Each structure stands twice: as structure tokens, then as C-alpha cells.
Amino acid sequence: MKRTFQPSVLKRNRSHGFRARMATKNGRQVLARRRAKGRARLTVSK
Amino acid sequence: METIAKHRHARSSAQKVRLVADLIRGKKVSQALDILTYTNKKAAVLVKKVLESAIANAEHNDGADIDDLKVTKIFVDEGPSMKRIMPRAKGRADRILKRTSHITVVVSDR
Amino acid sequence: MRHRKSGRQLNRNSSHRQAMFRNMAGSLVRHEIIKTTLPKAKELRRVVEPLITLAKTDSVANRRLAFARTRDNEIVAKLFNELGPRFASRAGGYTRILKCGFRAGDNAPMAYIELVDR
Amino acid sequence: ARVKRGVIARARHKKILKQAKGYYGARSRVYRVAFQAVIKAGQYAYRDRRQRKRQFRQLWIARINAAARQNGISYSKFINGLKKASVEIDRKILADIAVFDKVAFTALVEKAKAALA
Amino acid sequence: AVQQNKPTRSKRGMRRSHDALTAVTSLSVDKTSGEKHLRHHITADGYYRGRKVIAK
RNA sequence: GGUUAAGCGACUAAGCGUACACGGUGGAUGCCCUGGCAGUCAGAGGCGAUGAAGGACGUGCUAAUCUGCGAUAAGCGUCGG
RNA sequence: CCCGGCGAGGGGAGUGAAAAAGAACCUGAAACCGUGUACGUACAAGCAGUGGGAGCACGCUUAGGCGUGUGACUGCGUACC
RNA sequence: AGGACCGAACCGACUAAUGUUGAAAAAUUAGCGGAUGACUUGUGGCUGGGGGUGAAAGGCCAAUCAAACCGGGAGAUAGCU
RNA sequence: GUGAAGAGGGAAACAACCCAGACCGCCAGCUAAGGUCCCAAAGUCAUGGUUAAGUGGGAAACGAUGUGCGCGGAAGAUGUAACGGGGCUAAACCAUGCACCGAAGCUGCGGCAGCGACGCGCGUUGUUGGGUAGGGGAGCGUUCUGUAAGCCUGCGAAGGUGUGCUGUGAGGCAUGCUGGAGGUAUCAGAAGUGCGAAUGCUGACAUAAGUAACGAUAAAGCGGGUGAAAAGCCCGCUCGCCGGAAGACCAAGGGUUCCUGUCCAACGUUAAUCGGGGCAGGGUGAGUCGACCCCUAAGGCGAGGCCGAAAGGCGU
Ligand SMILES: [Mg+2]
Ligand SMILES: [Mg+2]
Ligand SMILES: [Mg+2]
Ligand SMILES: [Mg+2]
Ligand SMILES: [Mg+2]
Ligand SMILES: [Mg+2]
Ligand SMILES: [Mg+2]
Ligand SMILES: [Mg+2]
Ligand SMILES: [Mg+2]
Ligand SMILES: [Mg+2]
Ligand SMILES: [Mg+2]
Ligand SMILES: [Mg+2]
Ligand SMILES: [Mg+2]
Ligand SMILES: [Mg+2]
Ligand SMILES: [Mg+2]
Ligand SMILES: [Mg+2]
Ligand SMILES: [Mg+2]
Ligand SMILES: [Mg+2]
Ligand SMILES: [Mg+2]
Ligand SMILES: [Mg+2]
Ligand SMILES: [Mg+2]
Ligand SMILES: [Mg+2]
Ligand SMILES: [Mg+2]
Ligand SMILES: [Mg+2]
Ligand SMILES: [Mg+2]
Ligand SMILES: [Mg+2]
Ligand SMILES: [Mg+2]
Ligand SMILES: [Mg+2]
Ligand SMILES: [Mg+2]
Ligand SMILES: [Mg+2]
Ligand SMILES: [Mg+2]
Ligand SMILES: [Mg+2]
Ligand SMILES: [Mg+2]
Ligand SMILES: [Mg+2]
Ligand SMILES: [Mg+2]
Ligand SMILES: [Mg+2]
Ligand SMILES: [Mg+2]
Ligand SMILES: [Mg+2]
Ligand SMILES: [Mg+2]
Ligand SMILES: [Mg+2]
Ligand SMILES: [Mg+2]
Ligand SMILES: [Mg+2]
Ligand SMILES: [Mg+2]
Ligand SMILES: [Mg+2]
Ligand SMILES: [Mg+2]
Ligand SMILES: [Mg+2]
Ligand SMILES: [Mg+2]
Ligand SMILES: [Mg+2]
Ligand SMILES: [Mg+2]
Ligand SMILES: [Mg+2]
Ligand SMILES: [Mg+2]
Ligand SMILES: [Mg+2]
Ligand SMILES: [Mg+2]
Ligand SMILES: [Mg+2]
Ligand SMILES: [Mg+2]
Ligand SMILES: [Mg+2]
Ligand SMILES: [Mg+2]
Ligand SMILES: [Mg+2]
Ligand SMILES: [Mg+2]
Ligand SMILES: [Mg+2]
């Protein structure tokens, strides 16, 4: 069975990456929330 | 003079080792080594090493001679269990307990 | 029910059994003593000793039977040139099965089977 | 002022489990089962403190009946005669005498028979 | 189908009453080497019935 | 005396139960506090294009991670303690 | 030092006030699992107790019964929420 | 020539059996349908929740769908258990 | 009226029927309902009648030379099974009588408590004490604060675990062992104050059970090596399987799994000397391969711009 997660680094970075998050204010708020929570990994980037 | 050997965290369930332990309880140690030699169990190898260690402890630390020694007390206690996850069908996970045991042999001459 | 039936299945199908006993007969002929499980040794008697009896009479046809069996010219040559004459007078019982305890890996009853004149 | 329940809970559980000594299986090991066992045991003990008197009176009457019929009178007539003779020995003592003094019980039987005659 | 009641340690012991291993009745002693061995089995030093049957 | 007959009859524990002794497992309990929680009195109420918050990578006699630091890299100068 | 696989684990020795404080480490409860001992248990039917109760074992200190453990047999008795 | 025929790759999923605490949260085995097309497939892109998409089944939209998931209102409300 | 919210005795068993309302203790007595052959306590009781059907111990309409209450009618499916059983010719039925048994009822003895009356908290006395929802009263215990820079405590605290004593209870005290540094009277004060249930939550540990299973029925055998140990590791010889793949090379994806040495706790559904496991070391070399780069597609972003409460949407 084809499972739901079919990895693609390009698609991953484009849809969830740092620059994608910074592109919109809602993404920027995601980043602000993750910084407030103290996440070691802000995005899928690293 | 009682002399003890323990094998703590023996990797075998206490129920499997107690079968072998029952064979030699109260036996003369030469007879016990004979019995363990021809018992076709893993627990036989484990218990035999414990018994030989006990006999050697008696001879060396306590000065006793092997001909007088009997397996005065033998018991197997449960040691800590290692907990493992063995997947089953349909995404259900089952826990595997990998049980260990503490083998204690007490040899004495009287 | 298996009344009066003979031959051990040994948890193998027929082709595997036949191939395994061909191999094992070859090993027994070339080494003259092999260590195998007791049931396999007991069934191996019934495969090897007929080979030796066949080897008692040296002919082209007999050598071709001993080659159709065992499929090995090393083994056929040893049979007809050594074991045949070595056992020329002995009427059967060319092998000897010596029980030798238990296999460590799986507690199988092990046995040495050897040619009697080794 | 947080209160940890450990010591007090251990004390109550230990108390019940001590009362449950001798019971089979979980009934002496397991507090849920032991507590039920101890309560039922107390219930039984209360009921039996009553039943003990009935059982012993029944036993005394049986022994008195046996001894009286050995002396030729049934318990009914024997007790009736002792009432008639104004003899107030009770069944416990009467049964003790029946077992241990056949002569004294024979005297009592004769006294009762005289009263009934 | 599955139990309704936890079987007791008593019943577990009763079931296991037949699980005890039987020790080897007694060993044989080779007439030549003097080593003990299972009867009808070669000794650890390769003896059987007083014969060195396997070298080494 | 012995035999026979009749009657009655303990001694067994494969295991199991109860009690006790000694253990194992487990990590409760008690005790503990470099952690928190709530405040009081003060302080400061911002940081950032002189590049922030937050990171990446690096940096040691250093293999790792943490702390510090930034190719001048567990630190450089100067003034004072 | 010794057994052990140049193991694991253990027994000694030593340290220590204490290793039954040995790092799987303060105290170490209970479930659960054992070993030893006493008693019972293989003609016996059911909430497994309770009332009666023999026998046995054990500890006793007017030498007497007492205490403790067990519980043959027997009356009654269908858990808790 | 052909939404032509038979038939592998490939796409599907009609039947039966097995499996159904599976080898597998949908498979395996034996058969079956399409197999130059309204085909199939890689990579990338777009459509976002009362919204999308739908050769239309209330189908599908991350094993979730007669209204996704996550956080919040929120300790909703519960004459009920 | 009882149960609900009520135990006890009887009706075999049997909430609601009968008797009777449990304050506690007693190895005393008398009774109720109901009983008195044995199970099973008490009459194989007495007197006088009836029944022959096991009626008693299931039932009609109707029918019968039964007899001084009895018969047929009267068939069910696991087992007698429509007396509780054994059994009973009374141990059935009726009447009379006297006995006895029979309850946690009554009485006796000892104890506790509530309420009230009389007299000075005490006494005397009467009486009461089943209990759910619920109301009232009185306490126990836990943590913390004051008392308390007190008191106890290394001559052993808390905790744990036994034992004994003690109270109506919650409980309390003492003490052995363990433990090794805390505890805390008293009277007050405050509560995260008491658990067996919530298909409660978390951890631990059981059960089924040493059971099912060990994951493709392509398949192994033997010799040698190494090793503590080899079915599985290495070598060899056979053997079998794939071969439009189960071979080879990449992309994506992964990220050191690669190679060597070493180790075998854990991991590997077994063993393991072996390993994609632990540990250490090594290994990836580009002008030409690829990316980057140049160029664009779908699409994205988008100076200005247009639009929009704001956010923002579209777009040159
Ligand atoms: Mg899965
Ligand atoms: Mg035959
Ligand atoms: Mg097999
Ligand atoms: Mg074939
Ligand atoms: Mg506190
Ligand atoms: Mg206990
Ligand atoms: Mg059920
Ligand atoms: Mg079994
Ligand atoms: Mg026992
Ligand atoms: Mg060591
Ligand atoms: Mg300390
Ligand atoms: Mg400890
Ligand atoms: Mg314990
Ligand atoms: Mg009989
Ligand atoms: Mg008996
Ligand atoms: Mg039974
Ligand atoms: Mg009964
Ligand atoms: Mg076509
Ligand atoms: Mg489809
Ligand atoms: Mg079938
Ligand atoms: Mg198919
Ligand atoms: Mg077609
Ligand atoms: Mg076709
Ligand atoms: Mg529809
Ligand atoms: Mg879905
Ligand atoms: Mg909605
Ligand atoms: Mg609201
Ligand atoms: Mg709620
Ligand atoms: Mg109600
Ligand atoms: Mg009643
Ligand atoms: Mg009754
Ligand atoms: Mg009353
Ligand atoms: Mg009677
Ligand atoms: Mg009848
Ligand atoms: Mg009639
Ligand atoms: Mg008929
Ligand atoms: Mg019948
Ligand atoms: Mg009376
Ligand atoms: Mg009474
Ligand atoms: Mg009364
Ligand atoms: Mg009351
Ligand atoms: Mg305290
Ligand atoms: Mg205080
Ligand atoms: Mg609370
Ligand atoms: Mg409750
Ligand atoms: Mg089974
Ligand atoms: Mg089976
Ligand atoms: Mg099986
Ligand atoms: Mg396999
Ligand atoms: Mg080999
Ligand atoms: Mg293999
Ligand atoms: Mg090979
Ligand atoms: Mg690695
Ligand atoms: Mg490799
Ligand atoms: Mg392994
Ligand atoms: Mg090993
Ligand atoms: Mg590796
Ligand atoms: Mg464009
Ligand atoms: Mg735009
Ligand atoms: Mg603009």
C-alpha cells in the first residue's frame, strides 16, 4: 500500500520550510509561537 | 560453613530455571554436577556454572573439600524484566517481558 | 496410521530428502565418518550400504548405477576401488552408528555414523 | 497544607490484612478481597455468637436424651419430671452429668420418675 | 474463548505438577577410560565400550 | 506360641493450602532540596540597520554535549577591585 | 586472590560507622514470585468464612493448663459496589 | 484505421479460499478486467473546510469526513450515567 | 400489613407469607410461628375414630355394589423430580389432652449508651437503643502554624516490620528488629485531611502460559577453521532457488547503514564467534558526471499600480 508520507525534500521545504513560514504573517506567527515555546527546531529546515 | 554463589540477572525466566534447580536440590555436589552435565537445558548450563562457582568458592575461600559438599540450598528468584515491544497485526503493539532471574546456590558440608 | 511403512520423512519433501541423502552418502563415502542427527544416520544406513553392496561387483553397469545414485565420480571411484574390495567379504552392516550426545544449537540427538573398517 | 495519605492508608490496609490472616488466596493477600473477607467474617461471628448457644443447647439436649433413654425415659418426660420435682439443674450441667456421672444422672432420672409417678 | 476468573497460583502449581524434569537415572562408566557418559553414548573423550572410537 | 479369620488402622504429597522465617521483584513511604508556586519591597520598563529576538556553524590539549565566546572565538586591551 | 568465556555474575579480601550504603547504590511498603520449616490435604462437591472441634507441632514460667501455628470432622453460610 | 481483438510489462480489483490478537490497520494465493487510450506514470504546480474536488459514491481532501486537522472560546452544556 | 429501610425462627430453598422488631456479652432458662421416626432439636406420646388410595404427597365436569375418608377422571419432553430426602399403613387424616423442642421474642446475669422524672456533676428511678434517603450530636486520625531557641532524639527520630497491652470505634501506648536524623506534647489555628470501586489516572506486577507464535513450503548436507560453546559465522565440496530478477546501475528517499579491527550486555523473534548492533579507526578526490550556473513552463513572488475595515487580494 502506498502510504500517506511520500517524502520529498523539495516539497517539504517549499510547503513547511523556513522561508515559506516567513513569507506570510501566519507563518511568521507560527515561528513566533515556536520560539515562545522554545522549540529546538523551528521548522523542517534543519 | 555454608558457601554461596549467585548469578544475578541470569538471562532466563525463573520458571525455566527452577526446573533445573529442582533436580540438584539436596544432592551431593559431584552428583549435582553429573546431573547438570546431562540435563539438556540452557538453565542447566547456567545453574552448572553457578554450582561450580559455589564449589570453587567453598574450596578457596572456606577451605572445604569438594567431596563433603552438598547442594544445601538452591533457589531461583525473579530478576528485573526487560520490557520490549513486539508489534502485532493491525498496528497493535504487544509488550514482551524478557524475564531474568537470580540463581543462588548454597553448598555446605554439613 | 503408518502401519508397516518405512522411511523417515524428516520434514522434507521427497526431492529434498533424496538430494540430501545423496549428498550425505557422498560425505560418508569420502570421509568414512560423519556426524549427523541420529534419525538421519539411521536413514543413511539404508542409502549408503546398498551403494557398497552394489560396489561389491565391479562392472560398467554397476558403476553407472552408482553414478545415477550419488551422482559423483569421486564417490563412485572410491566405492568401487576401495570400499567394494574393503567390504568384499562382509555381508552387510558396513556402517556403524555411534550416538554422541546433543547438538548445542537445537538439542538434536547427534550420532557419528562411520564405515566399520575405518 | 497538602496531606499525603501514604502512612495512614498503609496502616488501615495493614490492619485489615492482619485480620485476614489464614484466609485462602487473595483473601489474605489482597486488600479489596481481604476487606470483604474480614467484613463477612465479622458478620458470621456476630451471627454465630447467637448460633453457638443454639448449637450447644441442641447438643446438651441430645446427650440428655441419650442418657435418659439409657435410664428408661425420654427427654420430654425427663425434663417434665424435673420441672415437677422443682429441680433446676440446666441442660448444660445435666449433659455434663450424663457424660461424667452415670450414677448421678441415674439419681436425677429416678427423681424425675418419682415426680412423674 | 477466554477465562472469566483469574486462575489461582494453586491451579498454576497443580498444572505444573507434571512439568518437573527427570534427572538422568545414572551414568555409565567406560571400562577403559573410566569416564562417565550417557549409556549408549560415546564419552566426551571419544570412547565407547572401552574403544577409542573417534580420535580427538 | 504359631497359623488362619474378622475388624480396625497410622506412616505417602505428584502437587496444593495456611502460618512463620528468610529472600527476590518493585519502588511506595519517611526524610531531603541547587526545582517550582504565590507574593512583597524596590528596579527596569524595552531590544533593533552601530544589525535585534532567535538560531546555524565554529571555537579548547578536546571525541561529544552543555556553558562562555566569535576566525582576536572558555577569549583580547585598559582602568579599578 | 578465586570460579567464570582475558565474560556477565558472584565469593573472598580491603575501605567504610554501615557494602544487607557497591554505583541496577538512603529508607526499601504492597501486589507478585520463591526457598526452608510446622501442620493439613489424593472418597471429596459450592462466596472458602464462621461456631464447635479432635489430632499434630511449637513456646511455656504454680506442672498445670496456657499461648501460637495448623484445622480432620461438623452446624450455618449464594462476594462487594 | 480502430476509446478494434488476444495477451505480458503496467493499471485495476470480479470471484473464491486463506488471513481476519494478519506477513498486511485491506493483503496473499488461484483465477479475473483494461492493456494506443475517456490509458498509465515520474517530477513540479494549483484548488482549503460550509471550502475544494467529484464520469456523482455523500466519494475523496495525509489510515480521520453527512463537513479535515490543530490551537483557542472551554472547566461549553449534560433535568443523564 | 410487610419489604423498601428489618436481621432472627418457620414456610425445603423462597424481599413483600407466618412468628417476631437485633444496644453488647453468656457453653443459663421460658416461649411464638412451626414442629417432635432418621437426615435434624423435641412424643416411634396417650385416648378414641378414618384411610388401603402411598390417598396423604397436583386439579376439575362426570362416572363407580370402595368404606365408616377414599377410586377413576390424571399425558411431556436431561433425572426419580407434583412428601425437601430417606422412608412411613402411621411417621397419613380428625378430635381431645398432657409433654417437650423451637427465635437475636421474653426472663436471668454482666456491661454500655440515649432520653425523662425525682434529689442533692453525682445518685436514684423509669424507659429506650433495626435502620436507607436524610436531620442532629460527639469524636479519631493526617499535613501545616503558634505554644516551641520548649520537649523527645545517634544511649537511635521519621519511616518500615513484628509483638504485647489498651479504648465502644476511628484509634492510642509500649516494645523487639530494621532504619540512620529527625520528631513533636498540650491547647488552639488552617486544611490539597482519610478511598475499594468512577469501562478513574500513573507506575509496578499477575493471568491465560512456558500456551500461540518465531513472518512466505526456494532446501539443505557434510568436512575443516575459529571459538567457552557452531544448524545458522568463515573456508571448501555438494545441494537447491532466482535469473525481464530475488542480477546490475541510478533517481527519489535515507544518512555512515560503506571498509577494517574489536566486543557480544541490549538489539537480531533462537544461538551467535556473525550483523545494517556497541566501540574505535578508515573511506567519498571531477574543467568533461551531477548540482550550482545560463534559459525558460506550469506556477510563485512582485517596485510602482489597481483593489480592499485592518490583515491583506490581484497584478505590470
Ligand atoms: Mg503497519
Ligand atoms: Mg517395518
Ligand atoms: Mg520442523
Ligand atoms: Mg520436482
Ligand atoms: Mg509538606
Ligand atoms: Mg502475606
Ligand atoms: Mg465476566
Ligand atoms: Mg505443561
Ligand atoms: Mg509449601
Ligand atoms: Mg567481576
Ligand atoms: Mg544519610
Ligand atoms: Mg536500597
Ligand atoms: Mg516485602
Ligand atoms: Mg463410594
Ligand atoms: Mg482421605
Ligand atoms: Mg471441588
Ligand atoms: Mg451449607
Ligand atoms: Mg482495445
Ligand atoms: Mg478504482
Ligand atoms: Mg478451505
Ligand atoms: Mg492476482
Ligand atoms: Mg477487451
Ligand atoms: Mg487484453
Ligand atoms: Mg446516498
Ligand atoms: Mg482517508
Ligand atoms: Mg459544522
Ligand atoms: Mg464560555
Ligand atoms: Mg467538562
Ligand atoms: Mg430505594
Ligand atoms: Mg425477614
Ligand atoms: Mg431456612
Ligand atoms: Mg430493638
Ligand atoms: Mg432427634
Ligand atoms: Mg401426591
Ligand atoms: Mg375423581
Ligand atoms: Mg401414551
Ligand atoms: Mg422421566
Ligand atoms: Mg420448653
Ligand atoms: Mg435463644
Ligand atoms: Mg431482647
Ligand atoms: Mg439506631
Ligand atoms: Mg514530618
Ligand atoms: Mg505543632
Ligand atoms: Mg482529597
Ligand atoms: Mg465506595
Ligand atoms: Mg491452553
Ligand atoms: Mg497446543
Ligand atoms: Mg506451535
Ligand atoms: Mg524466517
Ligand atoms: Mg559444520
Ligand atoms: Mg539455516
Ligand atoms: Mg558456504
Ligand atoms: Mg551507526
Ligand atoms: Mg558491512
Ligand atoms: Mg540473542
Ligand atoms: Mg552466550
Ligand atoms: Mg556496525
Ligand atoms: Mg511567470
Ligand atoms: Mg501577486
Ligand atoms: Mg506594493
Residue with cell 537445558: B41
Q: What is the three-class DSSP state of C10?
A: coil
Q: Is chain E adjacent to chain B, meaning 3+ CB pairs within 8 angstroms?
A: yes
D72 Ramachandran zone, left/alpha/beta (phi>0; psi -120 to 50): left
User: Is there a domain that residue C7 lies in?
Assistant: no
**Measured at the alpha carbon of residue D111, what is the angle toward residues D110 and D115, in degrees to the nearest 5?**
115
Q: Cα(C96)–Cα(D103) distance, rounded to whole angstroms?
A: 93
Residue type, C58: D
Whether D53 CB is under 7 Å from strand G:
no
Q: Cα(B31)–Cα(E56) distance, rounded to whole angstroms?
A: 27
Q: Which residues of E touch D25 (CB under 8 A)?
A: 8-10
Contacts for A22 with CB less than 8 Å, ≥ 6 apart: A28, A31
Q: Residue B55 sits in a domain of what CATH number?
A: 3.90.470.10
- The answer to whether the CB of D35 falls within 8 A of the CB of D27 is no
**Cα atoms in the Cβ-side hemisphere of radius 13 Å centred on E18:** 2
Nearest to D78 by CA among D93, D65, D92: D65
Which positions in chain D have a beta carbon within 8 angstroms of at least one beta carbon in chain E?
Answer: 25
Q: How far is the centre of ligand 16, averaged over its atoms, from the C-alpha of D31 (Å)?
A: 25
Determine the residue among C31, C100, C114 to mutate to test chain E binding: the one whose Cβ has the most chain E Cβ atoms within 10 Å.
Answer: C100
**Measured at the alpha carbon of residue B14, what is the angle toward residues B13 and B17, in degrees to the nearest 5?**
95
Burial of residue C41, with CB atoms counted within 10 A of its CB: 0-12 exposed, 13-18 middle, 19 or more buried: buried
User: Is there a domain that residue C78 lies in?
Assistant: yes
- Spell out the long-range contacts of C78-83 with Cβ–Cβ below 8 A and sequence spacing 24 or more: C78/C29, C78/C30, C79/C29, C79/C51, C79/C52, C79/C54, C79/C55, C80/C55, C83/C29, C83/C52, C83/C55, C83/C115
Question: In whole angstroms, how large is the CA radius of gyration of chain E?
Answer: 22
Residue with cell 418419682: D114
Q: Is chain A adjacent to chain B, meaning 3+ CB pairs within 8 angstroms?
A: no
C1' of I124 to CA of D89 (Å): 36
Pairing of strands E28-29, E47-48: unpaired
The count of structural domains within chain C is 1
Window 2-21 of chain D: CB closer than 7 A to strand G: 10, 21
Residue C38 belongs to domain spanning: 13-116
Residues C60, C62, C65, C69, CA torsion sign? negative
Residue of C nearest to E39 (CA): C99
The domains found in chain A, sorted by start residue, are 1-46 (1.10.287.3980)
User: Is there a domain that residue C108 lies in?
Assistant: yes
DSSP E5: S
**Measured at the alpha carbon of residue B33, what is the angle toward residues B30 and B39, in degrees to the nearest 5?**
145
Burial of residue B39, with CB atoms counted within 10 A of its CB: 0-12 exposed, 13-18 middle, 19 or more buried: buried
Q: Cα(D100)–Cα(D108) distance, rounded to whole angstroms?
A: 13
Q: Residue C97 sits in a domain of what CATH number?
A: 3.90.1030.10
Q: Bridge partners of C95? A: C115
Nearest to D85 by CA among D41, D115, D49: D115
Burial of residue B21, with CB atoms counted within 10 A of its CB: 0-12 exposed, 13-18 middle, 19 or more buried: buried
C18 Ramachandran zone, left/alpha/beta (phi>0; psi -120 to 50): alpha
DSSP letter string over D55-95? Answer: HHHHHHHHHHHHHHHHTT--HHHHHHHHHHTT----HHHHH
Contacts for D101 with CB less than 8 Å, ≥ 6 apart: none
Q: By what technique were these coordinates determined?
A: cryo-EM
Q: How far is the centre of ligand 28, averaged over its atoms, from the C-alpha of A30 (Å)?
A: 29
Whether C27 CB is under 7 Å from strand I:
yes
- The answer to whether the CB of C88 falls within 8 A of the CB of C60 is no
C1' of I180 to CA of C72 (Å): 82
Residue B8 belongs to domain spanning: 1-110
- The answer to whether the CB of D23 falls within 8 A of the CB of D57 is no
- The answer to whether the CB of E48 falls within 8 A of the CB of C106 is no
Element (H, E) at B29: helix B29-37
- The answer to whether the CB of A3 falls within 8 A of the CB of A9 is no
- The answer to whether the CB of C62 falls within 8 A of the CB of C84 is no
Q: Cα(C10)–Cα(B100) distance, rounded to whole angstroms?
A: 35
Q: Cα(C17)–Cα(B9) distance, rounded to whole angstroms?
A: 43
Query: Closest nucleotide to residue A11 (Cα to C1')?
Result: H44
Q: What is the three-class DSSP state of E16?
A: helix
Q: Cα(B108)–Cα(B4) distance, rounded to whole angstroms?
A: 9
Contacts for C95 with CB less than 8 Å, ≥ 6 apart: C28, C44, C45, C48, C49, C113, C114, C115, C116
Residue with cell 474463548: E1
Q: Cα(C34)–Cα(C97) distance, rounded to whole angstroms?
A: 10
Nearest to C32 by CA among C62, C91, C75: C75
Chain-centre distance of CA B88, in angstroms? 33
Determine the residue among E24, E25, E26, E28 to mutate to test chain B binding: the one whose Cβ has the most chain B Cβ atoms within 10 Å.
Answer: E24
